[PDB]
């Protein structure tokens, strides 16, 4: 990529068009002012994946971001794409969990172990093909190449280093093939011809000789090149936007068939057209599975709060004391795995304690009602948790129960849930069980 | 001997460069830091690159410490394109060779002088908390480091007690209507100084310059105080670099001291001096080593108490700034000195509705209150209430300058 050749043009400003590169650093409108592109950078396939929902009515995704400007910019584009459904079934994309890719150049199992739990039958990301080949054997070791696991990667898979590969049946795309240099040259020639047909509406310096003043008519030509629409190119109607952005409204869809990119369909403007020859899946299926399997394990966190919760030390056998009520009926016990916290600080014991009170019998009755299984935990912080500002990062972060639930580390919470605007903003709520003041 | 190079495009002060050289007191020398060049009134950057190839033909050069008497950040971008690409660590103290605006490369080695834009914004917060004023607007043009700039300022306001509750940002990438939209007694602004003439013409058209409103700009668009456009209004205060006492023999001695200290760590702890290069493209076979060549000793240097630590912003972490006020005669007049998170007092010119108010402490109508030293000196809903410094009656009893905060009925 001839970067300083482009960088010299930013002083005697010249309208430049980009032929080959899909790097997102060239979309920066501060330094790359007039540097258009025949091809959008790789964030366009995030818009392709936003088209991929309501192709087969798909509604869950977990992402992995390359810790780089490319993955962050693609994440920003898809985040802006997800701001929709302002009406007027609510089965749109709702999983939306994000993890990080680029430190997975050595170990990805810490991410994949979290990925295999949270009801994911989802596609994830485009990545560097070498670490993609690492996660292809890693997730196959963790058995994420199964039948229900839907898999789609993007553009960098098609490189030959990804041939420690991709369980058979995984969808690839081809937005712009475009690599006819006749079609690359002459369509740009038509674009600049329709440009100069309006640039004839009535001078740059002598290059790099003394005069370092900006040729202002270049930036004035930029607004005219914001009108040079060439609807009759070899690649069809050539369009533009404020920063490159060819706006090619077609792609072509293929999947692997014993490492053969067998085409599944195309796109046409607004019509995703599947030439449905064969539907392959990583478990060799021919259906179109979606959603997930709903689990039944719920790990509830809490803090010791009488008389809602009675954390009590267990006996020498680990079980609670067989204590009774006032009528001789035994109080229902639950071995609650607390934090270390048999003392302030970090005690050596991390001992599961007992649990009595309101919410224990309430949760037992609710588990018998809803007919689901059961786990427990206690909060290590011991605080309700406010949105405290993280130091030197200007980010206000919750703590306590909301330090675990909003981080996804915990399941549903029963608590003395004091309700405000902000907790309702981040946590969906049930109706108030016990009215208070 | 260590071939280093200095050039200031415009000056004629070689005797100051010899006084900054001053090679007799150097008891602690490494391999000898030789430095000699000639100046050339030329802004052509390709000529500068051929002069870089000329220095590599002179075979001694490893790094340079040079500047120019203009305000051109484009050559700082060129340095980021080229010298940050190949090898070269460059320090520059004048104008656009100090004003870095666009970016800093990740594989860079050079550095330009001046404080961070958010650090300068913190200086504005310090002086405006001294004067107890509050911005109730903001206008800002498009410039690199703007969203994080306004996020840092607003997030600093959210943590405070008394903040700048305003009239959120009008980014200027209906001009008279948009400048008539926001109103404030004290207005914080940023705009490029070349565009600031037209922007101040629009501000004079909407009358914002005539409402007794004060305008505060950062130093990077407060370029050199000897030429001010007439459309730039009066009474504008700004914080800037020390144009008064920091000249050539200070800056060349500082650059050569930083370079020689980086040397006398790099060739001493590790006993490894890098090799000077000869070509400007064919030297690539040994400068591929993004390696131990990358300096750690560059980011921590002090010489005779003058510290220089700098972060990854292209800005140092211990700056010394002066506060200048634009007069009606297009004259930038120094009113205050900002050392590291502290101010100076001498010229607190704070400025009919101005009426004198006298009172005496009687409960509960009055001050029952001290001044908190840290978090917003007069805390909340309490006007600052100056008191005469009752001293020994041979010097002057100072009116004001010991203050309290009035609450009461």
């Amino acid at each position, epitope marked *: 990529t001839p970067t300083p050749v482009s960088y010299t043009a930013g002083f005697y400003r010249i309208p430049v068009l980009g032929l080959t590169t899909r790097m997102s650093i060239y979309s920066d409108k501060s330094i790359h002012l007039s540097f258009l592109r025949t091809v959008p950078p790789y964030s366009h396939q995030s818009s392709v994946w936003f088209e991929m929902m309501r192709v087969y009515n798909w509604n869950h995704i977990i992402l992995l971001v390359s810790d780089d400007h490319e993955g962050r910019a693609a994440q920003k584009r898809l985040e802006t794409l997800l701001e929709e459904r302002e009406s007027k079934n609510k089965r749109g994309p709702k999983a939306e969990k994000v993890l990080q890719f680029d430190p997975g*150049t*050595k*170990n990805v199992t810490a991410l994949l172990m979290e990925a295999r739990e949270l009801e994911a039958r989802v596609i994830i990301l485009s990545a560097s093909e070498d670490d993609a080949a690492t996660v292809y054997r890693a997730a196959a070791m963790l058995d994420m190449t199964g039948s229900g696991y839907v898999w789609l990667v993007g553009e960098r898979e098609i490189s030959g280093n990804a041939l420690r590969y991709a369980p058979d049946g995984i969808i690839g795309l081809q937005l712009i093939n475009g690599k006819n240099e006749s079609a690359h040259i002459s369509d740009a020639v038509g674009v600049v011809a329709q440009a100069v047909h309006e640039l004839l509406e009535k001078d740059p310096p002598r290059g790099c000789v003394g005069n370092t003043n900006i040729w202002k008519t270049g930036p004035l030509f930029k607004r005219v090149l914001m009108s040079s629409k060439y609807a009759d190119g070899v690649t069809g109607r050539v369009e533009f936007n404020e920063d490159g952005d060819r706006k090619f409204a077609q792609y072509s869809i293929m999947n692997l068939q014993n490492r053969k990119l067998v085409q599944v369909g195309i796109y046409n403007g607004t019509h995703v057209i599947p030439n449905d020859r064969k539907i392959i899946w990583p478990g060799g299926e021919t259906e179109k599975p979606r959603g997930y399997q709903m689990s039944t394990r719920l790990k509830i966190v809490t803090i010791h709060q009488e008389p809602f919760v009675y954390v009590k030390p267990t006996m020498s056998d680990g079980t609670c004391k067989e204590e009774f009520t006032v009528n001789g009926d035994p109080v229902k016990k639950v071995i609650c795995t607390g934090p270390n916290d048999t003392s302030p600080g970090s005690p050596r014991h991390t001992v599961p304690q007992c649990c009595y009170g309101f919410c224990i019998d309430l949760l037992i009755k609710l588990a018998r009602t809803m007919q689901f299984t059961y786990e427990v935990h206690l909060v290590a912080d011991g605080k309700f948790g406010t949105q405290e500002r993280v130091q030197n990062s200007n980010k206000k972060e919750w703590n306590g129960m909301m330090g675990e639930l909003l981080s996804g580390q915990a399941d549903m919470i029963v608590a003395p849930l004091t309700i405000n605007n902000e907790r309702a903003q981040y946590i969906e709520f049930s109706k108030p069980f016990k009215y208070q003041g | 001997s260590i071939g280093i190079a200095v050039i200031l495009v415009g000056t004629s002060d070689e005797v100051a460069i010899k006084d900054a050289h001053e090679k007799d007191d150097f008891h602690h020398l490494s*391999v000898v830091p030789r430095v000699e060049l000639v100046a050339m009134n030329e802004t052509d950057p390709k000529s500068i690159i051929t002069r870089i190839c000329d220095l590599m033909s002179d075979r001694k050069i490893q790094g340079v410490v040079f500047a120019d008497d203009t305000d051109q950040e484009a050559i700082a971008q060129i340095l980021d394109f080229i010298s940050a690409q190949t090898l070269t660590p460059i320090l520059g103290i004048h104008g656009g060779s100090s004003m870095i605006m666009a970016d800093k490369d*990740e*594989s860079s080695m050079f550095f330009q002088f001046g404080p961070s834009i958010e650090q300068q914004a913190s200086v504005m917060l310090n002086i405006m908390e001294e004067y107890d004023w509050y911005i109730f607007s903001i206008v800002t043009t498009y410039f690199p480091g703007y969203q994080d700039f306004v996020n840092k300022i607003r997030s600093t306001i959210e943590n405070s007690f008394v903040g700048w509750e305003l009239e959120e940002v009008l980014l200027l990438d209906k001009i008279q209507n948009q400048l008539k939209k926001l109103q404030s007694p004290i207005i914080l602004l940023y705009c490029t100084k070349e565009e600031a003439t037209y922007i101040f013409e629009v501000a004079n058209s909407v009358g914002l310059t005539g409402y007794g409103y004060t305008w505060i700009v950062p130093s990077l668009v407060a370029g050199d105080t000897d030429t001010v456009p007439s459309e730039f209004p009066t009474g504008l205060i700004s914080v800037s670099y020390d144009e008064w006492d920091y000249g050539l023999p200070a800056r060349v001695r500082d650059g050569i001291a930083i370079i020689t200290t980086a040397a006398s760590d790099m*060739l001493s*702890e*590790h*006993s*490894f*001096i*890098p*090799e000077p290069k000869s070509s400007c493209y064919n030297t690539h076979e*040994k400068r591929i*080593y*993004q*390696s*131990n*060549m*990358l300096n*750690r000793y560059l980011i921590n240097v002090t010489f005779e108490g003058r510290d220089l630590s700098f972060s990854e912003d292209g800005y140092q972490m211990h700056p010394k700034l002066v506060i200048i006020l634009l007069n009606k005669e297009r004259k930038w007049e120094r009113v205050g000195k900002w050392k590291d998170k502290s101010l100076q007092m001498k010229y607190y010119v704070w400025p009919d509705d101005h009426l004198s108010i006298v009172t005496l402490e009687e409960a509960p109508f009055v001050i029952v209150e001290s001044v908190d030293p840290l978090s917003g000196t007069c805390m909340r809903n309490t006007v600052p209430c100056q008191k005469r410094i009752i001293s020994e009656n041979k010097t002057d009893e100072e009116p004001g300058y010991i203050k309290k905060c009035c609450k009461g009925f």
Partner: antibody
Amino acid sequence: KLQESGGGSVKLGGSLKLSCVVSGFTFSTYYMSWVRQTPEKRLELVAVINSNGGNTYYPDNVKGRFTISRDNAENTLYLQMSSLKSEDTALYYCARRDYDGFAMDYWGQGTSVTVSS
Amino acid sequence: DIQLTQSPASLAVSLGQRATISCRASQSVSTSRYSYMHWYQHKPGQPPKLLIKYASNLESGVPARFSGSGSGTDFTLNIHPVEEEDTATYYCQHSWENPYTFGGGTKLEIKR
């Protein structure tokens, strides 16, 4: 590639010139150093020299004891040991050639020096 | 000076197992873009050859079963799989602002 030689038996406080032969590369394009490997599996890095010898480095025990020299024509740079003690009884290697590059990459089979009376 | 501590000093593993070779330091020896170390191997009858650069970067053609990582003070190496030819003598040498400290030195045994 490389061959460190010039070893043998020497008394306490004796002298020995250790040899280090360049085999198959240009010699003044990098940095030199020398290591000594004890039978107790401990690294005694001896000294650092420059390709012109303008940067000679010793550690504290090597300061006042041992001497490095150059043979730039034959490309066999030497270490001249003196005031030898029983802790200097070790194998002896070399360490060079990272090409600025301020690490060291080439170690050899080396030679053995013993210091006993 | 920053000191290197390596464990287990007499490593005995099986072939095919992802063998973990840990290295702990006394101070952080890294930055955002790089780090100064070099990990390597030899047989005791063999010359030392370089294997791993700066934390992980590979030299000339070592088998890629060895995969080293770690940062700050910790440093690891994943041998997956283990070969029978790994009865080596080896450590890493600290170089961060001091190319003088060397590792503790672990040795290889094969539980086969």
